[PDB]
Amino acid sequence: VAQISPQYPMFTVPLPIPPVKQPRLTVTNPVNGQEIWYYEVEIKPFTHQVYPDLGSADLVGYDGMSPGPTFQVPRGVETVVRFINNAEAPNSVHLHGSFSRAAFDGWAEDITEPGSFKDYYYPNRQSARTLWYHDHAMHITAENAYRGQAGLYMLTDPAEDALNLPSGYGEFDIPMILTSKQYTANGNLVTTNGELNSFWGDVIHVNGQPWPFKNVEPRKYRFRFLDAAVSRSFGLYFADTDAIDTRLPFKVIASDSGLLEHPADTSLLYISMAERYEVVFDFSDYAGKTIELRNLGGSIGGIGTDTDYDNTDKVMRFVVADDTTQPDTSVVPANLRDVPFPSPTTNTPRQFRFGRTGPTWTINGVAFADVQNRLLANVPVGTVERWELINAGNGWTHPIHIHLVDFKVISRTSGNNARTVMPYESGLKDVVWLGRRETVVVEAHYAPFPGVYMFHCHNLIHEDHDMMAAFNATVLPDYGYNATVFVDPMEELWQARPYELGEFQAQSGQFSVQAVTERIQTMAEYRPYAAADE
Ligand SMILES: *[C@@H]1O[C@H](CO)[C@@H](O[C@@H]2O[C@H](CO)[C@@H](O[C@@H]3O[C@H](CO[C@H]4O[C@H](CO)[C@@H](O)[C@H](O)[C@@H]4O)[C@@H](O)[C@H](O[C@H]4O[C@H](CO)[C@@H](O)[C@H](O)[C@@H]4O)[C@@H]3O)[C@H](O)[C@H]2NC(C)=O)[C@H](O)[C@H]1NC(C)=O
Ligand SMILES: *[C@@H]1O[C@H](CO)[C@@H](O[C@@H]2O[C@H](CO)[C@@H](O[C@@H]3O[C@H](CO)[C@@H](O)[C@H](O)[C@@H]3O)[C@H](O)[C@H]2NC(C)=O)[C@H](O)[C@H]1NC(C)=O
Ligand SMILES: [Cl-]
Ligand SMILES: [Cu+2]
Ligand SMILES: [Cu+2]
Ligand SMILES: [Cu+2]
Ligand SMILES: [Cu+2]
Ligand code: NA
Ligand code: NA
Ligand code: NA
Ligand code: NA
Ligand code: NA
């Protein structure tokens, strides 16, 4: 249907690459002698000329950019991020794909108001994967993410570097953060505030930039795909501008939780809100050609209900040079890793129905705000459980995200006979798309930390009002590991704290080297992640 947003100079701006986020300093952990990387991120408003000939867009973003700066953290190193709210609305940051403790996981009610900050303590022990950090505050997640609070967080492993995949952030390892938004006639953003069904958007962005291009060499590149849209699911494929309907083959090497066992040969990649898929595409056969990254119409080939606009078929253009400056020395191994699948269970699965109770998106008839009823499962730490995630509807789709765990996709049924499990769903994931009349069974090890965590639809509109619930990963009184201060997300010890803007800008008071050091060392003494020492 007709584009609403003003006309855009398609494919004339280079793909922006988000700068790497650098820690301010390191703090010696008095428990294990090791350095903790400490960072400071300031949430704050800014403007961006999106359309060159019109007014500007009002955004609010981590370090006043969008997308957020990219974190690059090696397994083994613990990090503390101080997220400082200097905006006009509260925040709650969730590091998606990290088994953070409940109070550092971005619980929706665990907000930081403007004029406050919170110290997030992260383990970085899991399999190398593409995480992302984004807002998760109650009722306002959609608008906070839409206005720029999402960013990449790369967890790296020397062991994976030996696979010799295309490499170098910004070089031959390119982030591909997808979003879909709408613009007023003067090039400002059309707000999500008030939308209750779904906010599709008619302008496709990669890394913050509408319909860009990138000059690439005829060799192999690693693409880290993130669907950071509020509501738009994609069906991604590559095509020569000479043969715009003819899909070029590629390899999917990683899902949400890391590498697959083996590259999945693919020419169409379904990707819904909050899914990460890492792709290697070889441009060597297309020297001198232009390859368009494109999006499937017909509501993602009838899997979805998403509205399609004039140019939502288009994502970006790669302009391929005649030669490489240097030889492509990278490979894509047949065998990537041994995926740590959970031990199968024959325990009878729990059922969760993603539907509508009146005007409200619900889980098993319950809305997240209904505190009395929103705790839908107690699961003893260490248990494997199967959860049957059921979309009965033909008029909505739901990418379901379960915090804490990595899970395996066991099965998919479709009431429209559309599909079952995809080859790129062969690995470990933390989000799964319930397409039209789809029911999916997933299997997860509820481990290794006790605490109350969220699960929900990752359609941010549906998520806000109000398709979100909670599980408690429980332990018995004899357990230890300081679990008493770490199962309640609202725990006082970990709550946001006020700051004066002058302290922060001068790096004094609470922000002195000495005070940061006192704070981190104290946090580290509680030993948040001891139970995952092997
Ligand atoms: C998510 O799941 C977690 C478990 O992983 C739940 O947390 C547990 O909740 C129970 C109930 O609150 C806790 O048990 C209670 O402990 C409290 C204090 O215990 C300590 O201090 C007392 C003195 O005050 C000592 O005697 C004791 O040994 C401990 O050192 C008390 O409030 C409770 O005592 C009363 O209830 C029991 C129940 O039978 C009686 O036996 C007692 O005599 C007494 O009448 C109780 O023992 C447990 O400690 C919690 N665990 C952790 C790790 O925090 C979460 O509550 C759950 N969350 C949600 C939202 O459901
Ligand atoms: C659970 O968390 C608590 C609280 O942080 C841990 O107890 C604390 O352990 C640290 C050691 O890491 C103690 O440090 C102490 O410093 C003082 C100097 O003032 C010194 O006198 C002591 O010899 C020691 O080095 C700290 O006192 C202690 N805090 C309390 C309140 O006991 C505890 O280890 C954690 N338990 C687990 C299993 O993780
Ligand atoms: Cl750039
Ligand atoms: Cu998320
Ligand atoms: Cu998450
Ligand atoms: Cu949904
Ligand atoms: Cu979440
Ligand atoms: Na920065
Ligand atoms: Na401000
Ligand atoms: Na070739
Ligand atoms: Na886990
Ligand atoms: Na302490």
- Contact in structure between 123 and 78 (CB atoms under 8 Å): yes
From the CA atom positions of the chain, what is the Rg in Å?
Answer: 22
Clarify whether residues 327 and 180 are in a common domain.
yes
Listed residues 296, 319, 337: the one ending a domain: 337
Report the separation in Å between the CA atom of 225 and the middle of ligand 8, taken as the mean of its atom positions: 21
What are the pocket residues of ligand 2 if the criterion is a CB atom closer than 6 Å to any ligand atom? 30-31, 480-482, 525-527, 530
Q: Is the dihedral of CA 307, 309, 312, 314 positive or negative?
A: positive
Question: Separation of 402 CA from ligand 5 center, angstroms?
Answer: 6
Instruction: Report the helix count and the strand count for the chain, using DSSP H and E.
Output: 6, 32
Which residue is closest in CA terms to ligand 1's atom 5?
A: 474
**Looking at residue 398, which CATH number applies to its domain?**
2.60.40.420
Shared domain for 416 and 453, answered yes or no, is yes
Q: Please say which residue of 317, 337, 357 terminates a domain.
A: 337
Same domain for 348 and 461, yes or no, is: yes
Experimental method: X-ray
Closest CA to 354 of 307, 402, 302: 402
Q: Which atom of ligand 1 is nearest to the CA of 479?
A: 53
The answer to whether residues 308 and 361 belong to one domain is no
Encode 154-180 in three state secondary structure. EEECHHHHCCCCCCCECCCEEEEEEEE
Resolution in angstroms for this experimental structure? 2.6
The full length of the chain comes to 534
End-of-domain residue from the set 322, 337, 352: 337
401 by Cβ neighbours in 10 Å (0-12 / 13-18 / 19+) ranks as: buried
Q: Which two tokens stand for residue 452?
A: 């109350």
190 contacts 183 by C-beta, under 8 angstroms:
yes
- Residue type at 311? N
Place of tokens 């280079």: 14
Residues 111 and 150 in one domain: yes
Tokens of 13: 């701006």
Residues 183 and 285 in one domain: yes
Give the DSSP H or E segment for 445.
strand 438-445
- 201 and 288: one domain? yes
Same domain, 521 and 432: no
Determine the Cα–Cα distance for residues 385 and 472; give it in Å rounded to an integer. Answer: 13
DSSP string covering 415-437, please? TT------GGGSS-BSEEEE-TT
Q: Which helix (H) or strand (E) holds 269?
A: strand 269-271
3-state secondary structure 277-306: EEEEEECHHHCCCEEEEEECHHHHHCCCCC
Q: Residues 208, 302: one domain? A: yes
Dist CA 347 CA 422 (whole Å):
24
- The residue ranges of DSSP E strands in 136-257, in sequence order, are 150-156, 173-181, 203-206, 209-210, 213-216, 220-227, 234-240, 250-255
Same domain, 135 and 166: no
**Tally of structural domains, the chain:** 3
Considering the domain architecture, whether residues 278 and 353 belong to the same structural domain is answered as no
Enclosing domain of residue 316:
1-18+157-337
Question: Residue with the nearest Cα to atom 6 of ligand 1?
Answer: 474
User: Do both 390 and 450 map to the same domain?
Assistant: yes
Report the separation in Å between the CA atom of 125 and the middle of ligand 12, taken as the mean of its atom positions. 22
Q: Cα–Cα distance between 322 and 98 in angstroms, integer?
A: 41
Q: List, in sequence order, every beta strand (DSSP E) within 326-430.
A: 350-357, 360-363, 375-380, 384-390, 398-402, 407-414
Q: Residues with Cβ < 8 Å from 255, sequence gap 6 or more?
A: 275, 276, 277, 424, 425, 426, 427, 428, 429
For the Cβ of 472 lying below 6 angstroms from any atom of ligand 1, the answer is yes
Which of 474, 486, 491 most suits a substitution to test ligand 1, by most atoms within 8 Å of the C-beta? 474
